[PDB]
């Protein structure tokens, strides 16, 4: 797996024509508060390509 290239799958906002996301936040997947901690309903925007 070449895990050098990634893709922001985890994001709620749709992007505007030519927009570049580069943030490293904890994607909240629901109402469960993430509070800067990775886990259930708390994943990460980027998804490494296999």
């Amino acid at each position: 797996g070449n895990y050098n290239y990634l893709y922001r799958l985890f994001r709620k906002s749709n992007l505007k024509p030519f927009e570049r996301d580069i943030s490293t936040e904890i994607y909240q997947a629901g109402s469960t508060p993430c509070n800067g901690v990775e886990g259930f309903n708390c994943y990460f925007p980027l998804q490494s390509y296999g």
Partner: antibody, heavy 124, light 112 residues
């Protein structure tokens, strides 16, 4: 996921060495890394940590200046600079990745996956 | 520095029995954001550790259900529901709050 640690062997008191942590099976591009040592029968003790893209070079007192760390984000490898090695660093060295990839998941904190370890012996 | 002491130094417990391992921090490890930054490790004999308990009370991926953590502020306890023959080895705690990362001294759960 594999954490292959390379290098290591018998080095001279005061000599030099450099260690390689070749990682695969995961991103490593947004993950922090840790270096952990264990002198024979003396317990896990910390050495080093690095951020997602280097720059953040975090060391213990006993490795102040004397050790430095680096990563090859293209080739997905971790490195470790050594100089003037004393007898207290004779140990097996583990490179370990942080759990995770967000902030407040401290780059010097939880260590999810560990390697197999290579022995670094300082003697004559 | 955060110097952490484990209790007790050894817990030889027969398999099938329950076991608790306690490690108390010198300082307060609570609420960097609202959690308890103490992590629990098991170094099984001859091989490398992996995480057992993170954030004081929670566990990582794939851990046996028998493990659980408890305690807040300075006192923290690991709670093994049922010791078995694969549980042998040293247990470590770590403070995950300040940059000098200190581990425990190592208490083995063994079979006596």
């Amino acid at each position: 996921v594999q954490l292959l640690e390379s290098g290591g062997g018998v080095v001279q008191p005061g000599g030099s060495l450099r260690l390689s942590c070749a990682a695969s099976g995961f991103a490593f591009t947004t993950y922090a890394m840790n270096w952990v040592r264990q002198a024979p029968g003396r317990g896990l003790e910390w050495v080093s940590a690095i951020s997602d893209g280097g720059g953040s070079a975090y060391y213990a007192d006993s490795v102040k200046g004397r050790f430095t760390i680096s990563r090859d984000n293209s080739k997905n490898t971790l490195y470790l600079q050594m100089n003037s090695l004393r007898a207290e660093d004779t140990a097996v060295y583990y490179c370990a990745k942080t759990r995770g990839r967000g902030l407040y998941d401290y780059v010097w904190g939880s260590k999810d996956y560990w390697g197999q370890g290579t022995l670094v012996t300082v003697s004559s | 520095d955060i110097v952490m002491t484990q209790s007790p130094l050894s817990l030889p417990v027969t398999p099938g029995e329950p076991a608790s391992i306690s490690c108390r921090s010198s300082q307060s490890l609570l609420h960097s954001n609202g959690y308890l930054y103490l992590d629990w490790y098991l170094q099984k004999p001859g091989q490398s550790p992996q995480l057992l308990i993170y954030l004081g009370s929670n566990r990582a991926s794939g851990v046996p259900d028998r493990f659980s953590g408890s305690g807040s502020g300075t006192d923290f306890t690991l709670k093994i529901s049922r010791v078995e023959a694969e549980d042998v080895g040293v247990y470590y705690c770590m403070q995950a709050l300040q940059t000098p990362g200190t581990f425990g001294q190592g208490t083995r759960l063994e079979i006596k």
